[PDB]
Amino acid sequence: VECDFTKLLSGTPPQVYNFNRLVFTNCNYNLTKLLSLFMVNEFSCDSPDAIARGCYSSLTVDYFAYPLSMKSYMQPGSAGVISQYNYKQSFANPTCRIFATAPANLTITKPSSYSFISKCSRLTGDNSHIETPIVINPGEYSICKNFAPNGFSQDGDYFTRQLSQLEGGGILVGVGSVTPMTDTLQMGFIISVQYNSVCP
Amino acid sequence: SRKTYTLTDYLKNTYRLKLYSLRWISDHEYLYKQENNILVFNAEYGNSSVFLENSTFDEFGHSINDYSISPDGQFILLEYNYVKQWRHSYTASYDIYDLNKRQLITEERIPNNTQWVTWSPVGHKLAYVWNNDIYVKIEPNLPSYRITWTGKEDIIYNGITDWVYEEEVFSAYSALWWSPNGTFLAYAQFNDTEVPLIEYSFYSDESLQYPKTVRVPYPKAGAVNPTVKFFVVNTDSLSSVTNATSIQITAPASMLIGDHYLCDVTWATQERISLQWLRRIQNYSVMDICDYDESSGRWNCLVARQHIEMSTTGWVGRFRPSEPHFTLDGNSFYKIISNEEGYRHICYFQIDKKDCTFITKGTWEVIGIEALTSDYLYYISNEYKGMPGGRNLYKIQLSDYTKVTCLSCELNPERCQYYSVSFSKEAKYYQLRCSGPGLPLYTLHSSVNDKGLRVLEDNSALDKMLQNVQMPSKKLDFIILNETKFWYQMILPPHFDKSKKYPLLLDVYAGPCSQKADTVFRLNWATYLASTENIIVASFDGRGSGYQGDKIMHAINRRLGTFEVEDQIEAARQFSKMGFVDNKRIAIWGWSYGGYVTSMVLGSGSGVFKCGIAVAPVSRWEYYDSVYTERYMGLPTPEDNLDHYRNSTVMSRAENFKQVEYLLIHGTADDNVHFQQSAQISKALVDVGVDFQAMWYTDEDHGIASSTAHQHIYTHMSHFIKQCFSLP
Amino acid sequence: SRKTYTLTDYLKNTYRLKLYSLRWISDHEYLYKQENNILVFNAEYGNSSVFLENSTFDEFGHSINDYSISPDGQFILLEYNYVKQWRHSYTASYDIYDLNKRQLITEERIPNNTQWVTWSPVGHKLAYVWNNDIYVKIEPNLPSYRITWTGKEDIIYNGITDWVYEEEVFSAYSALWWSPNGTFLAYAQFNDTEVPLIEYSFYSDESLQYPKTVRVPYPKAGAVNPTVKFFVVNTDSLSSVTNATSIQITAPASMLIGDHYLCDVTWATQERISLQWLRRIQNYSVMDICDYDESSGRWNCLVARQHIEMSTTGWVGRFRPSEPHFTLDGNSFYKIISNEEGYRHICYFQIDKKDCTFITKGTWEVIGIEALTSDYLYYISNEYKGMPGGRNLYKIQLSDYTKVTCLSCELNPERCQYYSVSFSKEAKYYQLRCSGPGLPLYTLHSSVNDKGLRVLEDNSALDKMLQNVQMPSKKLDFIILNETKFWYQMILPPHFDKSKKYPLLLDVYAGPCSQKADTVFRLNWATYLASTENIIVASFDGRGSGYQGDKIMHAINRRLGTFEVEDQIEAARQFSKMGFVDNKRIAIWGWSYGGYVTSMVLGSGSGVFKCGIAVAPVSRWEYYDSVYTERYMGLPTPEDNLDHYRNSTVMSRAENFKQVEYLLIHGTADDNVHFQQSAQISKALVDVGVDFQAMWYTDEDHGIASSTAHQHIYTHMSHFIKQCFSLP
Ligand SMILES: *[C@@H]1O[C@H](CO)[C@@H](O[C@@H]2O[C@H](CO)[C@@H](O[C@@H]3O[C@H](CO)[C@@H](O)[C@H](O)[C@@H]3O)[C@H](O)[C@H]2NC(C)=O)[C@H](O)[C@H]1NC(C)=O
Ligand SMILES: *[C@@H]1O[C@H](CO)[C@@H](O[C@@H]2O[C@H](CO)[C@@H](O)[C@H](O)[C@H]2NC(C)=O)[C@H](O)[C@H]1NC(C)=O
Ligand SMILES: *[C@@H]1O[C@H](CO)[C@@H](O[C@@H]2O[C@H](CO)[C@@H](O)[C@H](O)[C@H]2NC(C)=O)[C@H](O)[C@H]1NC(C)=O
Ligand SMILES: *[C@@H]1O[C@H](CO)[C@@H](O[C@@H]2O[C@H](CO)[C@@H](O)[C@H](O)[C@H]2NC(C)=O)[C@H](O)[C@H]1NC(C)=O
Ligand SMILES: *[C@@H]1O[C@H](CO)[C@@H](O[C@@H]2O[C@H](CO)[C@@H](O)[C@H](O)[C@H]2NC(C)=O)[C@H](O)[C@H]1NC(C)=O
Ligand SMILES: *[C@@H]1O[C@H](CO)[C@@H](O[C@@H]2O[C@H](CO)[C@@H](O)[C@H](O)[C@H]2NC(C)=O)[C@H](O)[C@H]1NC(C)=O
Ligand SMILES: *[C@@H]1O[C@H](CO)[C@@H](O[C@@H]2O[C@H](CO)[C@@H](O)[C@H](O)[C@H]2NC(C)=O)[C@H](O)[C@H]1NC(C)=O
Ligand SMILES: *[C@@H]1O[C@H](CO)[C@@H](O[C@@H]2O[C@H](CO)[C@@H](O)[C@H](O)[C@H]2NC(C)=O)[C@H](O)[C@H]1NC(C)=O
Ligand SMILES: *[C@@H]1O[C@H](CO)[C@@H](O)[C@H](O)[C@H]1NC(C)=O
Ligand SMILES: *[C@@H]1O[C@H](CO)[C@@H](O)[C@H](O)[C@H]1NC(C)=O
Ligand SMILES: *[C@@H]1O[C@H](CO)[C@@H](O)[C@H](O)[C@H]1NC(C)=O
Ligand SMILES: *[C@@H]1O[C@H](CO)[C@@H](O)[C@H](O)[C@H]1NC(C)=O
Ligand SMILES: *[C@@H]1O[C@H](CO)[C@@H](O)[C@H](O)[C@H]1NC(C)=O
Ligand SMILES: *[C@@H]1O[C@H](CO)[C@@H](O)[C@H](O)[C@H]1NC(C)=O
Ligand SMILES: *[C@@H]1O[C@H](CO)[C@@H](O)[C@H](O)[C@H]1NC(C)=O
Ligand SMILES: *[C@@H]1O[C@H](CO)[C@@H](O)[C@H](O)[C@H]1NC(C)=O
């Protein structure tokens, strides 16, 4: 059949920790229409021409709400709190990232705000005084995802849940911050692909 | 012969103690209010020059109450229409008067019913709270900027403390903390939504025919505590076209397990703030040190910078955890924590290294840290002659910790033994405020070479008036008991001989970390009782009294009313077997917690005591507030400590009151210890059928500080004591 | 010297006055409950039958305190789970027990927390009030029919009265009035929406850690008052398929111009009712008589049928305007109407005639009509020997008004002088309950020939056990002060001698239309004080006392707290000048109004009295409720009576309290005279600076009726009296 980037523009976008992997366009792959409707703000990854033309095997996508006023924590090399807790870039496959801004047209629906976990550490000990942060894999979700994955209402929201064994056996504390809503919605597009059916 | 200290002299305050209250405004200049005139004084020379005139403020139709000075000296802040709300909180009107233009600023006045106004430490920035909202003025003749929009009456408190925090945690109405150079404003937000209220009727003046009912958010023992949040707002980036953004600093995740408190906030340097948090089970506290980054403008508190204080035997701190004292660079600080032996001493702390090195050691407790410079550190301790009552000033050398110099040990050994200090801005000068066995003496010193500059006050005319009149004499000693010295005081009558037996009134507080045998000169009701009626008034420091190590203080942990009561009874027994005390005329009286101790001693059935007064006593620990009761008893949860919660009631000992005479006094409009408590005591006493005396004082707070009510209550107490002792 | 009437004898009720309480179910018979068994007594021949046994009582799972009998005798109503709310109001649970089947009814039982249940006068119709809504059951085993849908807690009362009407106007909790044969149900609906609320805290048992607040609609003096409506529903046309409807009988046109009350409701004949309305300015009352209209289905009231009672010199009636006593045909009625001279007497009325002809005349007052069959009218009056303190039963022939016979004057002149009577259904038999100077004696009489059939109770055992105690005497006499006869009573100690001087305690009530000098046998605190402490307890009837003419009673109109105070002072002066009263040991005590009179006497500065007790006194008349204050003082508008409202306060004369000893006792949960009044008294007394004693009684009503608190308060007043009089 014929497939394209239709499921990315439906409903409300999720946040950076609540990221949605999707695998589609197996038979045919469509080029330069998601970039046409949603303009690009930067393109630097470890080229547009190499990912534009050339057949592939399996293409995956990543999209989440990500403001442009804060961009520097997610780099190929960085020490941001978002990189260590929420999402880390995957380097196992040729991938490139894209930050997009919604135009004045209201094709997408805006969420309440942009939110992200500031602390996802594990509490363990006799008096629960030893603190150990939980770093996350680039291809795995943070364990603080179940603390309101829709979003955080205020800046200081903390939600705690006792972890199951088979996970560490300590109390988990998840604190999520929030940034104020901008004028228009803003998208973080990350595309990974590996080398044959997915061809333009 | 000569006259004695009468009750009229005490109530009318004829013999008035002269004080010298000065506020430092610079390195070497301080203010003084002499004859309703603000006077600038010089520390080095002593010459005084006039700062504010008489007529410059009385030209208005409202009499001023107090003055606040800007650090630059450009403006004076005057307050009037003073209305007291609680012990610390009040509402008043404010106005700003310029000193260069010498006129009043009526451009944008501070609105009426202002809750709390503070100046910036430098410059002339203002931060006043109105309707539980934070307003900041860069200049007094400029429009104000609104910081918090979520303030609400008795629900959300922004920048001002609620009832429980003001009474116990912060001991103040202020929750605003400026940066050291007046750039960042730090405020705390208190949420009171799920906390239950307390209702007491307020029968106002006779014109009003329907009494009002007061609603106070009051978390009792086992109730839900208020939720605290912490914010810091940058005041340099303020604009009138957009809302100010406040960056929230979250609590450490060790405290996010359950309920927690914010107990101390201290600014380290211009971009670093140190927060101290206290758990609901007040035996585990962590200090959070947060830095301000420039890349994001978010306050980051590293895990490695957290410092953990815990107590395995009792509660951390004396009442609240002690504040740190940072150095100039802010990379290290000095803090007072308990050592391995159980005595509070000073640790040199590093903001990155967890361990502390003790710089003081011994069998004495460091009372507090007063001033820190790069060369020396000044502190107050009770080391000198080993008396826990006495206080003296010591300075230690930061380079060599074994060289300790005392600055108030030998200034006046027979007169001044309880010293208090007040350093300058650079701590170049300190005014010593002794209040020892003699009259209070106020001296001014310079810290460059510890030379006495002059004497500010010595109460000469008061000395003549007191040498005219017969006055009681104090006596400080101790008893051995269970191989641990316990100190006591006795206000002996004039011309006191051991052969004649005197009646005893055991003035008792016996609270946790309370001192009642200090060398402090006071003109109180006990001086009238000793001087006129010839009554030995005594106080005791049993188990739970502070400044004597954690072994004594923490013996009363999770058990109130069973140990200090036994120590008070034992002290009465020892006093009776001293020889000069009539055993048949021993009484007991106390205030608040002292009333609870008095009620428990009378209900213990020991038979030592004849009559007892308990003004505003504590009855059941499930009626007092959450912080104070849970610090020393824990939650009233029936798997943890409900047995001692239900065993430590006065009403369980109501049958034993038949052998003693009880006088129960309480205020109807009390907010600290409610009228419910004395209502329950009276209900138990009339259900058992015990004859007792009672008295209620309407529209009276816990202090009962109104002059007519104070005179009436002390006259009634004197009448009850005289009728109990059958004094001529 | 045998034993005396001790305090514990009064407190523990060792000497119990035996009561013979009976209820007539028919002309012939009556029921007397004895040994927890119900017995039918045939009044002619004795004939002690049985009605209920112990088996019904112990077969149920809960205790039963009160019973009610259906008039046909086929059902008994049992009351359990008694929870008292006010003086007359209560809530309880009910169940109907059939007697024909000897089984308990289990279908559609009366719901829990039912405010008021009443039986129909004939048949077995049952109407009860639950959640301020009226439910009518034709049969006890049938579902109820809802009458009112507008019931609301503390807002709208249907079939029951609110606080003010129950306390003052109706003196009962029942606002339901059945038709004479149980066809119509007439109820009054009360609106409480603009009535301001009183709020006093309620400290419950020790488990409750937060005191509840009691919210009561309490119309104070000059405030908004409840609005009363009237309705009549038809129980014969009750159907479950549709809502029952009622017809509102409106007030007369002379009452709707201003605020009005509804004081008395009486079913005149089988199909007509006689409503009695009273103005807010309580000196103008109009009785409205309304007839049922069969053609229209509504109730019409004629202007010519209205009868107007007026009082120029003061208020109308004694407390409330008296109820009429209609004849059998309903074409005439008898009412107590004040004469032109002032004394209240029976006046024969007609429905369509304005004028009435008085049937009794003299310088005495008729207390009230009791019964009339067709030819004699039975009334109680104080005509005998010119004693307003004595009551006797009189009968008068209807045809010839000169024929007046006393049925209780000569029965026992030396023992009984205070008669109260209870009649049968057709008034052929009446039980005379004399409580005169002697012990209470109960007799049974037949009205046909006025012969004593038998005595029901004569207190033989109490007369046996009263020989071992020194009972106090009782002297009733008069003094002539202002050319008028003023009566007084004295409880004298045994072996009383005129030579020896005794202490005098003036037990004073002094309320408007209050008799304190009657010949009623009492076993109370005065008996203990006279017998044991040898204290003369005296009472006086000054200006404002009732049953002595309108000239004495209405002299206090619009001036409260002036003439009764000087009357009490002059009575004390006369008592001290008689000779047997010690002039330096005179005290005074009172309850409610008595406390107010005691407070104004002590604050008057007369100096006659030594000490005083005021148990729940009235302080300011703006604090007390609207009906009682406005009846004798008028509204406190600035242009009518505000001057004497602000001149007749206790707090205005607190300066003169320094010469006397004051004891101030008040219950915190008091709803009649709130704690606000004693709080204001205490505040004024500590503002002036007067030493006095006090005691609050938590969770206590106006009467202090709980046994432990009653014993404690009487022990404390005994201790205060003994200490004041310098007695052992
Ligand atoms: C101060 O504390 C109170 C509670 O102690 C806070 O009120 C709470 O506000 C949250 C919203 O942030 C409410 O949650 C909401 O509940 C509704 C109903 O269950 C639900 O439909 C929503 O999806 C949301 O979960 C919460 O119920 C409410 N709690 C109350 C009213 O007891 C209050 O927000 C705090 N103050 C500030 C300034 O945050
Ligand atoms: C602070 O006090 C709490 C209880 O008030 C202590 O917690 C208990 O410690 C014992 C020690 O074995 C355990 O058995 C209990 O299960 C603990 N209870 C709870 C609720 O945690 C605690 O040890 C104290 N000291 C700290 C926190 O340093
Ligand atoms: C600053 O914040 C406050 C609080 O959010 C804003 O005030 C509210 O604004 C909304 C939107 O106009 C109104 O619906 C509310 O009624 C306002 N509440 C109050 C109490 O005023 C305010 O508008 C903000 N100011 C700016 C400049 O954005
Ligand atoms: C008050 O202290 C603050 C905190 O350091 C100062 O703010 C910084 O000042 C430095 C230079 O001293 C600048 O490089 C930073 O950009 C400033 N940061 C911010 C957030 O303002 C401030 O300058 C000081 N004010 C005064 C008058 O000395
Ligand atoms: C109870 O009294 C009512 C009121 O009079 C009686 O009802 C009336 O009875 C007469 C006699 O038959 C009728 O003519 C009327 O139409 C009835 N009026 C109403 C409104 O019902 C009733 O009969 C009496 N009860 C008994 C059992 O006789
Ligand atoms: C009880 O009284 C209140 C007022 O005292 C009544 O409320 C009024 O109802 C009328 C409807 O006829 C409205 O026009 C008024 O505006 C209402 N006033 C207020 C203050 O609410 C209420 O209806 C009465 N209740 C009953 C059952 O009679
Ligand atoms: C009798 O009257 C009551 C009150 O007027 C009726 O109850 C109301 O019925 C309506 C629907 O018809 C509801 O919307 C209301 O909520 C009801 N009120 C209450 C207090 O229950 C009742 O339906 C009527 N019954 C008949 C048989 O007419
Ligand atoms: C009921 O009492 C009121 C007030 O006590 C009387 O009203 C006064 O009447 C006199 C004589 O007419 C006037 O001089 C006053 O101005 C009235 N006062 C007010 C406030 O209206 C009233 O007349 C009395 N009613 C009767 C029938 O005697
Ligand atoms: C100022 O007022 C005080 C007291 O009000 C008075 O003693 C003094 O003389 C006045 N003048 C100066 C210059 O202090
Ligand atoms: C005291 O005198 C010195 C000069 O000797 C002067 O500089 C100083 O300002 C004076 N102090 C005051 C407060 O006027
Ligand atoms: C405060 O009250 C006074 C008294 O009327 C008034 O003159 C003044 O304007 C008020 N303050 C403000 C800011 O309105
Ligand atoms: C404490 O209370 C419990 C139960 O209430 C009881 O078993 C125990 O004996 C009490 N301990 C005392 C009174 O010392
Ligand atoms: C019923 O019980 C009471 C006491 O409970 C007893 O005095 C009485 O004799 C009993 N009567 C019968 C008939 O059993
Ligand atoms: C007693 O009363 C019963 C019914 O109550 C009656 O049958 C009996 O005849 C009466 N005894 C007499 C009249 O002697
Ligand atoms: C009253 O309460 C009891 C127990 O609470 C219950 O058994 C009974 O059914 C209730 N009455 C009614 C009418 O529901
Ligand atoms: C009330 O007292 C005042 C005294 O200030 C007096 O002038 C006035 O006449 C009095 N009013 C009366 C007695 O009605």
Numbering used by the authors:
A (entry chain B): 385 to 430, 433 to 581, 586 to 590
B (entry chain A), C (entry chain C): 39 to 766
What did the paper state?
Merbecoviruses from bats, pangolins, and hedgehogs pose significant zoonotic threats, with a limited understanding of receptor binding by their spike (S) proteins. Spike (S) protein is the major viral surface glycoprotein of MERS-CoV and forms homotrimers. For the MERS-CoV S-trimer, NTD is known to mediate cell adsorption by binding sialic acid, while RBD is known to bind the human dipeptidyl peptidase 4 (hDPP4) as the entry receptor. The S2 subunit mediates membrane fusion and exhibits a higher level of sequence conservation among CoVs.
Here, we report the cryo–electron microscopy (cryo-EM) structures of the GD-BatCoV and SE-PangolinCoV RBDs bound to hDPP4. The GD-BatCoV and SE-PangolinCoV RBDs exhibit weak and strong affinities for hDPP4, respectively. In the complex structure of GD-BatCoV-RBD:hDPP4, the total buried surface area (BSA) is 1586.9 Å2 with 764.4 and 822.5 Å2 on RBD and hDPP4, respectively. In region 2 of the GD-BatCoV-RBD:hDPP4 complex, RBD hydrophobic residues L509GD (β6), Y544GD (β8), I557GD (β9), V559GD (β9), and V561GD (β9) form a hydrophobic cluster with hDPP4 residues Ala291DPP4, Leu294DPP4, and Ile295DPP4 (region 2). In region 4, Q540GD of GD-BatCoV-RBD forms a single hydrogen bond with the glycan linked to hDPP4 residue Asn229DPP4 (region 4). Therefore, the interface in the GD-BatCoV-RBD:hDPP4 complex is substantially twisted by comparison with other RBD:hDPP4 complexes. We further found that the interaction between D541GD and Arg336DPP4 in region 3 could be a major determinant for the twisted hDPP4 binding by the GD-BatCoV-RBD. Although D541GD is conserved in SE-PangolinCoV, MERS-CoV, and HKU4-BatCoV, only D541 from GD-BatCoV-RBD forms a salt bridge with Arg336DPP4, bringing the Arg336DPP4 loop closer to GD-BatCoV-RBD, thus leading to the observed deviation in hDPP4 binding by the GD-BatCoV-RBD. Whereas hDPP4 binding by GD-BatCoV-RBD K505AGD, N513AGD, and Q540AGD mutants remained largely unchanged compared to the wild type (WT) (top), the D541AGD mutant, which disrupts an interaction with Arg336DPP4, completely abolished hDPP4 binding (top), highlighting its critical role in GD-BatCoV-RBD for binding hDPP4. In contrast, N229DDPP4 has a weaker effect for GD-BatCoV-RBD (433.3 nM versus 255.4 nM) and SE-PanglinCoV-RBD (111.8 nM versus 9.4 nM).
